[PDB]
Ligand binder design. Structure first.
Ligand SMILES: [Mg+2]
Ligand SMILES: [Zn+2]
Lengths: 455, 1341, 51, 50, 49
DNA sequence: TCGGAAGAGATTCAGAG
RNA sequence: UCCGCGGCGCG
DNA sequence: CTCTGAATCTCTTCCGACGCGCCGCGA
């Protein structure tokens, strides 16, 4: 039915009606002894009508309706991307699902996503009915419904009770590779944005400029056991495309670590000796030494011995205050040399990989979380920022460009004297411009990259 | 000098380049084309008159009677625009046409008339464009996008062998009419020439050539060049042009002047050609092999027998040569085949043709075009003739004629719209020349080749369709019956015309729904250009080459503004200065160069002419004499940039900004940032939402004034004067004495659109921005609109921004916001939603609006009146009833045992059920307006009668207040005329105003003026009473509504929405960001003076996106407010105004060689104080797009502001109280809210409705459906071993009509069992496959 | 309509155990055919099935 | 010749836009082909299980 | 039932064999105007055929 | 009531008889 | 409680 | 000089991401 009492007829009904009409017409022309050519015309029309019914548009001009569109025959209900096979048999719409705009949450552990309270209430409303009747607070489904729609805070207590171990699935369209769907143990936040852990967000190929994400809740207990054992993000550390880890930091985390490990030739408190990394942290936080200052520190490390024991060693090493601070979080078993250099993205990647090979899964997970926290905090304290004076323009550039244009004029006038073909003139001009551009780039990099300071 | 109004907030320009041409009226194309469509025209060139004359008159032969057209006129639109928008009726006016019917006598001459009848036909209703350039269709605003399509004419095109792939090149030339069939001509890998009609088939070209009245020998004589040979006994002569020798190899000795000389086996070169030319050779003697291998040009006859031995296109058979030579026909004619210059292609076509004669080709063409029917000579002839040469079935419009001739280099510019024989043969010759290589194919993507078709052309096309349908109806009526006893009023049926025009305006792909987020968005949508639509192009078939930029886009189409995604390239925006040539080609202004001095005259060019000349780059520096400083001035010409001397330059760009549209032009510092990010920012700027309170942007572009005034939202001073009165909603202005027309009241009034639903649910509000007694000037802005302040565009807001990573809350473009922003309602926005309630006369009893609702608490009903309508002003929340409506449920018979079961249960199982309208879930707000519309003959309830009473009272008070104001103006004019002389001011003062108007102070023209205004007063009171009577009948009259509905009620709900984490905000340079945290104001970083930062952005995005310009913007912001802060303090200390005056003069002088040059010495001190009051909040800075502020000027401005010269400052972290070691960039930035609020997207469904056929859950937020587990996600699950969750996803959660019930039961019971049945969609598939006639069934049950 | 594209006598009742003629209204006669018409006292699900 | 810090003239900017719209159209088209290819590969290899 | 159509043509009573109900229709020159109105339970409702 | 690739059918050319 | 078609819009 | 097979040419058919959001319209 439609507004105003009208009805939308499915095109199949119209095709059926046309075929019925033609059949009735042919039978009437037969039973009243029509002439030959008339019944031949009627039966040819009937055959054409059957062709339209099954596969309209398969031959000749397609049938069309008042909208001047071709009617969808039975065959069109199975062919094509709108067909029954692709649309419904695969790719079903599903109950117990929601969608929301995502958002960074840095305070989350690795395996827990921040889920808005309203969505949680809506999704788990059946479970809430169940537990509310089970605990005897509500007697009938009507009572449960009216209670939950009034949000009597006891419903909020029940809701906090239900989800405590109940993993949910997060999905980002398009699900390019299987990492696109992952399992998380929810945490309840007021607001309306789903909060992710940035590390896995890097794996999602997602960003935060307004990307939406969909959440599904498993129903059965076998299903949630599967979600926990297989899909939980604490398991998907290694990509399937290659052995290297997928959980790798980027942006502020890497910037913070890089700043934390970079040393300078002269800084506050250079050359002093620290009896332990804790004292390095103290001297930094008390403000008597800057992170970049180089210092000797007593440090203990461990190695997996031939038997499998973490045999200890302790020694004095030259390092930086920042490097000692970072080392303090490193779990037992990794060698100190891993830290004692300017840490880039690739260095952190290989550090995570070597952690995962040397030690088990869980120390690597804890190491990842600690890395994320410390990197963010020290990046914030760093206060790195970009200013217009930073993009220094190498003053050589004007000279180099004048040289290049002089050569361009020279080759152009050489062509003006007819000494060369135009194509080779073009080639020469292109070559000299490329050479000049490379020279300018080298000058810019040389001027920017290094600077002089007093010792 | 500045107008007095503009003295408020004189924005500081920085542009160095002067401006020689003001930006044109931005909407001009739409308004002027529609005017051209509707306005009267005696010449019948365009619009209604042209359309009518293109069909009329109409003549009947057996009827011996004629229908002919006198004139057309457009009636009055019965409803005003706001009434149309309120009541939902299309804004239209009646089309009236004067028509005459003629009958002649039944004797020669047929022209002897005997009777004439004339009357006016109401042949249709037509929409009118509103003053803002938008149409009003039903209840909606709609604006027609001007299309850009391939021009009619002829084009020449080649593919780089892609089709055949052997490496050759193939050519085709195509002719496109304005309407009618399309012909194209094509070569072949076998070099045959083929012709095709509407791309039907592929046929040799000779078919048409003989279909045209030409025989084979005529064809050869026309297309090819002929050579003559003579035979005498067995000696052979040929007649030669020496140049004809060029190209061949002299394998045999060749004779001239009686001497024979050839280097055998060698190619004839220019020395040989010159030798023969100086020899002046005419006829030479050649061997038999030379004439061998030559084609027979024509038939040859032997008179000794009356026999023919030579045919057309035949090779030279030596036997035939001997026979004809002995017969006596010693002369022979042959063609010439230069392997490069004179390809034998036509001859090969003549060989391969199946046809033999004109009628054979005609019937073959007919059977090609009309398969499945027996050919007939008349049928084929009629088909061909009417197809190409019936000026009504086919027509190259005049633009088609111009392009056709100009591509064929013919002198003529005009001609008949139908083709001809010479046209076809000429285009074929041109294609042959192209195949020879003495030419070049055409470039269709070139902008001198595509054409802009505006609304007028589409409107007249649809109206012509209506006219031809009506013409067929009229000729049918003429044929069927008599001619005397009827009037053409019945003969013409308006239905086809109205059907066609309404179908165009409602349905058509180019009649797209308008967007109204902000005035800029409305402007850019009106101006937008689309390549799609009727006769256009499809997103699937659009290759890269049409999308890509073409070098003649410069100055005509903005390259930046294109939308992103699959539509890219196919949608564009007019550049700011571009205007349409009468032929629809784009046109750009330029400045004439005259011997090194720019004349400053303006000339308009199209892509062809621009390509022909040399035009200088805009940024070229000049002296005051007009001579360029540099001799080697850089310029562009013929699609390439280079350097040229001062004298070679022909034209100069008008202004720097002429390459970009308005949308890009608004962005400051555009010259400093990448194109991708600039594009994204330009597009995003359209989506901005108007805030609760407008704010100026500090770093603007000057364009804001023009855009704000040109859009329709702001009320502009149409007549200068002094503002007499202002309130929240009305403006009354006294027109000055000189400006007012004689007999006018001298007072004008404006009424502001106080609150209404925008087309995207945003608010639309107009706020006055003047005060009593302030002078106002022609073109001043009296009332601001949405996102407008003092007549400047005010999309965004000014925020204090620090660039610094902060604890990951700004990770990956995330934005962190200080709570102070929320507390000040800086980004709070007002939204309006409209809800409709429909009461129907349904079967099983009618459905009525009422407050008598079953099974509901009375407290909710108390919010409603006794009629069942909420009182305006009541707050309402999700799930509550706004209006009560009730549906009968039919009989609902209960057996007596069920009757007693119901009785013990209660009042349940009622035959009457609630249907009342309910608040959408999660929405809450306040109820601002209620509307009712009801069918005639039904009683008006309490709510209906009360609102009708209030509305009629409103109309009465409005009309009476208009009367009072205008009569006060009239009597003020009485005073002004009477004081002029012969005064009796006190003697009149004792008398009441009626005496003043009645009495005569003199006997002269003054008394004539008094009598004139008294008659004016009588006329205005009579028109006022007539207007109020019409208004009252118009209010009291019922409405048509729709079938089946008795009465509709609409209620208006308004909601205030607030910035919240998950909301998306973005800055003009295109750096989107989701707000991810609000912060207690204490925690935000704060500078040395203790004022906190407001918004913290991640810096890491800047180098990788290359949005360097935005950083510069930030710096300028820190400078701008700097001055503001200082001047604010300088005001707060309440010092002498002269000191701040000199300071302001310094601040304006600060620029170097800036065009501004404003001086305060002419300003009186109260004006200076007003200026300071507006400048207290910062000094707005104007930076043109490509002549913007330089870094040196920025530094100087900062230095005058006492801020750090680098723009970086020290900063303290509030959360610990320590100091960041690095300096940080803190400044001011302009930010927008992007209308993607989180509460519009968050959605969740536990369970709900289910679809009918597939039994799957519904889709979409509105239906409260669930998300779609697409096939990619299914593959993702398959990649894991997670079988069980997949099975649960498919069977139980989605499609099992019983399994999900079992699951719901077990979950409620607390048992997480599962039972997978069968997906019902599988049974659906089985039934459809079986219905197809294919047996499919399960096995092993 | 009888014998039409939606003829209830063929495809079964539009409503659960509701005879087109109104002869029977409840499950007490579940699985019987009305005499005035060939519709069957059954569930609406049969409408989905029968061809 | 001018870098991003100094202003680009209108000519440099205009010629630069070519690459920008080329890249945007490039990615717009590439997405469809990539998705289609993935659908194919999945269909061919979906039977294989250890 | 509505006695005249929107054009003011006069109306005649007809049986809809496809739906077994009376309806009203209008004619001009004896041909059907292509307008009809039907009874939908106490509310005559009208439109194109 | 639009270009590209693959497959099938038809037509043409070369080799063999 | 609903089959869409067209259109913009964001991923 | 003719017949058959193979090769080439012509014509027809298939394909050319996943996901959400609003608006209009619907003989
Ligand atoms: Mg994204
Ligand atoms: Zn029955």
């Amino acid at each position: 039915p439609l507004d105003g009492g009208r009805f939308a007829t499915s095109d199949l009904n119209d095709l059926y009606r046309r075929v019925i009409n033609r059949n009735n017409r042919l039978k009437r022309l037969l039973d009243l002894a029509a002439p030959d050519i008339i019944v031949r015309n009627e039966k040819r029309m009937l055959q054409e009508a059957v062709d339209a019914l099954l596969d309209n548009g398969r031959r000749g001009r397609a049938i069309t309706g008042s909208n001047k569109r071709p009617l969808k025959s039975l065959a069109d209900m199975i062919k094509g991307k709108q067909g029954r096979f692709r649309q419904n048999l695969l790719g079903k719409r599903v109950d117990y699902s929601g969608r929301s705009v995502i958002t960074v949450g840095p305070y989350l552990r690795l395996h827990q996503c921040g889920l808005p309270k309203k969505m949680a209430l809506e999704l788990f409303k059946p479970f809430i009915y169940g537990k509310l009747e089970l605990r005897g607070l509500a007697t009938t489904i009507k009572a449960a419904k009216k209670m939950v729609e009034r949000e009597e805070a006891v419903v909020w207590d029940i809701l906090d009770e239900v989800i405590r171990e109940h993993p949910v699935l997060l999905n980002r369209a398009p699900t390019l590779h299987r990492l696109g769907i992952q399992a998380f143990e929810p945490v309840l936040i007021e607001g309306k944005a789903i909060q992710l852990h940035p590390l896995v967000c890097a794996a999602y190929n997602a960003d935060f400029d307004g990307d939406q994400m969909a959440v599904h809740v498993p129903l059965t207990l076998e299903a949630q056991l599967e979600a926990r054992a297989l899909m939980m993000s604490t398991n998907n550390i290694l990509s399937p495309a290659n052995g290297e880890p997928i959980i790798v930091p980027s942006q502020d985390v890497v910037l913070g670590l890089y700043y934390m490990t970079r040393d300078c030739v002269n800084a506050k408190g250079e050359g002093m000796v620290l009896t332990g990394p804790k004292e390095a942290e103290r001297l930094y936080r008390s403000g008597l030494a800057s992170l970049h200052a180089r210092v000797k520190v007593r440090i203990t490390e461990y190695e997996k011995d031939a038997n499998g024991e973490l045999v200890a060693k302790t020694s004095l090493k030259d390092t930086t205050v920042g490097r000692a601070i970072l080392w303090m979080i490193v779990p037992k078993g990794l060698p100190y040399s891993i830290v004692n250099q300017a840490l880039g993205k690739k260095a952190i990647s290989k550090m995570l990989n070597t952690c995962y090979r040397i030690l088990g899964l869980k120390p690597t997970v804890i190491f990842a979380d600690q890395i994320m926290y410390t990197g963010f905090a020290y990046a914030a304290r760093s206060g790195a920022s970009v200013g217009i004076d930073d993009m220094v323009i190498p003053e050589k550039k004007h000279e180099i460009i004048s040289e290049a244009e002089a050569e361009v004029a020279e080759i152009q006038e050489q062509f003006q004297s007819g000494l060369v073909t135009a194509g080779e003139r073009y080639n020469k001009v292109i070559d000299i411009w490329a050479a000049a551009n490379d020279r300018v780039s080298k000058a810019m990099m040389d001027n920017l990259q290094t600077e002089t300071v007093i010792n | 000098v500045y107008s007095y109004t503009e003295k408020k907030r004189i924005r500081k320009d920085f542009g160095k380049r002067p401006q020689v041409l003001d930006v044109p009226y931005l909407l001009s194309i739409q308004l002027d084309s529609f005017q051209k469509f509707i306005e009267q025209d005696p010449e019948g060139q365009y619009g209604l008159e042209a359309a009518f004359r293109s069909v009329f008159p109409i003549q009947s032969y057996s009827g011996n009677s004629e229908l002919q057209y006198v004139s057309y006129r457009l009636g009055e639109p019965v409803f005003d625009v706001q009434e149309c928008q309120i009541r939902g009726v299309t804004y239209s006016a009646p089309l009236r046409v004067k028509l005459r019917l003629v009958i002649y006598e039944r004797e020669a001459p047929e022209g002897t008339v005997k009777d004439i009848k004339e009357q006016e036909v109401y042949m249709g209703e037509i929409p009118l464009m509103t003053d803002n350039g938008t149409f009003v269709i039903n209840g909606t605003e709609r604006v027609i996008v001007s299309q850009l399509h391939r021009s009619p004419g002829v084009f020449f095109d080649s593919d780089k062998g892609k089709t055949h792939s052997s490496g050759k090149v193939l050519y085709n030339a195509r002719i496109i009419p304005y309407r009618g069939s399309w012909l194209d001509f094509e070569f072949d890998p076998k070099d045959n020439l083929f012709v095709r009609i509407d791309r039907r088939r592929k046929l040799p070209a000779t078919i048409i050539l003989r279909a045209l009245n030409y025989t084979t020998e005529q064809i050869l004589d026309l297309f090819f060049e002929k050579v003559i040979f003579e035979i005498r006994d067995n000696k052979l002569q040929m007649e030669l042009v020496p140049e004809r020798l060029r190209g061949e190899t002299a394998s045999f000795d060749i004779e001239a002047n009686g001497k024979v000389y050839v280097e055998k086996g060698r190619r004839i070169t220019a020395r040989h050609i010159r030798q023969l030319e100086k020899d002046d050779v005419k006829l030479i003697e050649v061997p038999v092999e030379y004439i061998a291998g030559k084609v027979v040009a024509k038939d040859y006859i032997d008179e000794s027998t009356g026999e023919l031995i030579c045919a057309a296109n035949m090779e030279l058979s030596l036997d035939l040569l001997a026979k004809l030579s002995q017969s006596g026909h010693k002369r022979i004619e042959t063609l010439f085949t230069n392997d490069l210059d004179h390809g034998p292609y036509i001859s090969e076509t003549l060989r391969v043709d199946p046809t033999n004669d004109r009628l054979s080709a005609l019937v073959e063409i007919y059977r090609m075009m009309r398969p499945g029917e027996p050919p007939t000579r008349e049928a084929a002839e009629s088909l061909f003739e009417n197809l190409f040469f019936s000026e009504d079935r086919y027509d190259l419009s005049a633009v088609g004629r111009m392009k056709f001739n100009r591509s064929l280099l013919r002198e003529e510019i005009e001609g008949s719209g139908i083709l001809s024989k010479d046209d076809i043969i000429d285009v074929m010759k041109k294609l042959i020349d192209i195949r020879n290589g003495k030419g070049e194919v055409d470039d269709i993507d070139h902008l001198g080749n595509r054409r802009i078709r505006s609304v007028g052309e589409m409107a007249e096309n649809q109206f012509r369709v209506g006219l031809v349908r009506v013409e067929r109806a009229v000729k049918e009526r003429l044929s069927l019956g008599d001619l005397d006893t009827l009037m053409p009023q019945d003969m013409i049926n308006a239905k086809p015309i109205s059907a066609a025009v309404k179908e165009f305006f409602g349905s058509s792909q180019l009649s797209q729904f308008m967007d109204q987020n902000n005035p800029l968005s409305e402007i850019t949508h009106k101006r937008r250009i689309s390549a799609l639509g009727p006769g256009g192009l499809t997103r699937e078939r659009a290759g890269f080459e049409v999308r890509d930029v073409h070098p003649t886009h410069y100055g005509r189409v903005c390259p930046i503004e294109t939308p992103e995604g699959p539509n890219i390239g196919l949608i564009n925006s007019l550049s700011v200065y571009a205007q349409t040539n009468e032929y629809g080609f784009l046109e750009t202004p330029y400045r004439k160069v005259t011997d090194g001095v720019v004349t400053d005259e303006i000339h308009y060019l199209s892509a062809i002419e621009e390509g022909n000349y040399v035009i200088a780059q805009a940024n070229s520096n000049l002296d005051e004499e007009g001579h360029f400083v540099e001799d080697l001035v850089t310029c562009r010409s013929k699609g390439e940039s280079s350097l040229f001397s001062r004298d070679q330059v022909d034209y100069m760009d008008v202004s720097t900004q002429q390459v970009v549209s308005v949308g890009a032009s608004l962005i400051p510092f555009l010259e400093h940032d990448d194109a991708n990010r600039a594009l994204m920012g330009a597009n995003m700027q359209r989506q901005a939402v108007p805030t609760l309170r407008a704010d100026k942007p500090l770093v603007g572009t000057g364009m804001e004034r023009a855009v704000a005034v040109d859009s329709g939202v702001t009320a502009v001073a149409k007549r200068g004067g002094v503002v007499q009165y202002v309130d929240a909603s009305r403006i009354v202005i006294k027109v000055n004495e000189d400006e007012m027309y004689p007999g006018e009241a001298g007072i004008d009034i404006y009424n502001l659109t106080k609150y209404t639903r925008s087309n995207q649910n945003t608010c639309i509000n107009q706020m006055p921005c003047v005060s009593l007694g302030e002078p106002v000037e022609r073109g001043d802005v009296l009332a601001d609109g949405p996102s407008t302040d003092l007549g400047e565009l005010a999309l965004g807001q000014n925020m204090r921004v620090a660039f610094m990573p902060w604890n990951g809350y700004n990770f990956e473009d995330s934005i962190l916001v200080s709570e102070r922003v929320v507390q000040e309602d800086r980004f709070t926005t007002i939204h309006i939603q409209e809800l409709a309630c429909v009461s129907r006369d349904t079967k099983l009893g009618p459905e009525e609006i009422t407050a008598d609702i079953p099974n509901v608490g009375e407290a909710a009903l108390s919010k409603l009146d006794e009629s069942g309508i909420v009182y305006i002003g009541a707050e309402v929340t999700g799930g509550d009833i706004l209006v009560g409506k009730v549906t009968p449920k039919g009989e609902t018979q209960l057996t007596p045992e069920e009757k007693l079961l119901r009785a013990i249960f209660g009042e349940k199982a009622s035959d009457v059920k609630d249907s009342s309208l309910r608040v959408p879930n999660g929405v809450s707000g306040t109820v601002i307006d209620v509307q009712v519309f009801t069918r005639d003959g039904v009683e008006k309830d309490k709510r209906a009668l009360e609102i009708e009473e209030m509305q009629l009272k409103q109309a009465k008070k409005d009309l009476s207040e208009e009367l009072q104001i205008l009569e006060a103006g009239l009597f003020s004019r009485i005073r002004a005329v009477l004081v002029a002389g012969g005064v009796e001011a006190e003697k009149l003062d004792k008398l009441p105003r009626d005496r003043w108007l009645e009495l005569g102070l003199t006997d002269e023209e003054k008394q004539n003026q008094l009598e004139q205004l008294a008659e004016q007063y009588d006329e205005l009171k009579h028109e006022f009473e007539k207007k109020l009577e019409a208004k009252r009948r118009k209010i009291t009259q019922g409405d048509d509504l729709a079938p089946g509905v008795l009465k509709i009620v609409k209620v208006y709900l308004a909601v205030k929405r607030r910035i919240q984490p998950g909301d998306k905000m973005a800055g003009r340079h295109g750096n989107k960001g989701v707000i991810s945290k609000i912060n207690p104001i204490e925690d935000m970083p704060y500078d040395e003076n203790g004022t906190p930062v407001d918004i913290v952005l991640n810096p890491l995005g800047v180098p990788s996106r290359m949005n360097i310009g935005q950083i510069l913007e930030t710096h300028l912001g820190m400078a701008a407010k700097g001055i503001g802060d200082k001047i604010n303090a300088m005001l707060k200390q309440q010092q002498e105004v002269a000191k701040l005056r000199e300071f302001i003069q310094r601040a304006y002088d600060l620029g170097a060689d800036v065009r501004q040059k404003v001086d305060l010495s002419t300003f009186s001190d109260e004006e200076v104080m007003r200026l300071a009051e507006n400048l207290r909040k910062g000094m707005p800075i104007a930076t043109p797009v490509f002549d913007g502020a330089k870094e040196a000027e920025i530094k100087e401005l900062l230095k005058l502001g006492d801020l750090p010269t680098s723009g970086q400052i020290r900063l303290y972290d509030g959360r610990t109280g320590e100091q960041f070691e690095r300096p940080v960039t803190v400044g001011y930035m302009y930010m927008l809210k992007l209308n993607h609020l989180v509460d519009d997207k968050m959605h969740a469904r536990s369970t709900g409705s289910y679809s009918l056929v597939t039994q799957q859950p519904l889709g979409g937020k509105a239906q409260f459906g669930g998300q779609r587990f697409g096939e990619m996600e299914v593959w993702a699950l398959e990649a894991y071993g997670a079988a069980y969750t997949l099975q649960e996803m498919l069977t139980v959660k989605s499609d099992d009509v019983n399994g999900r019930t079992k699951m719901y039961k077990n979950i409620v019971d607390g048992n997480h069992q599962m039972e997978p049945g069968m997906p019902e969609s599988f049974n659906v598939l089985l039934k459809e496959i079986r219905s197809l006639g294919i047996n499919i069934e399960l096995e092993d049950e | 309509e009888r014998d039409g594209l939606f003829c209830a006598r063929i495809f079964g009742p539009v409503k659960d155990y509701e005879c087109l003629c109104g002869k029977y209204k409840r499950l007490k006669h579940r699985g019987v055919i009305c005499e005035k018409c060939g519709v069957e006292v059954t569930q609406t699900k049969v409408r989905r099935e029968r061809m | 010749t001018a870098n991003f810090r100094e202003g680009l003239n209108v000519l440099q900017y205009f010629i630069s836009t070519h690459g920008a719209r080329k890249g945007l159209a490039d990615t717009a088209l590439k997405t469809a082909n990539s998705g289609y290819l993935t659908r194919r590969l999945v269909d061919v290899a979906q039977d294989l299980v250890v | 039932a509505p006695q005249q159509d929107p054009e003011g043509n006069k109306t005649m009573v007809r049986f809809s064999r496809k739906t077994k109900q009376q309806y009203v229709s209008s004619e001009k020159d004896g041909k059907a105007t292509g307008w009809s109105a039907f009874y939908v339970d106490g509310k005559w409702v009208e439109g194109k055929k």
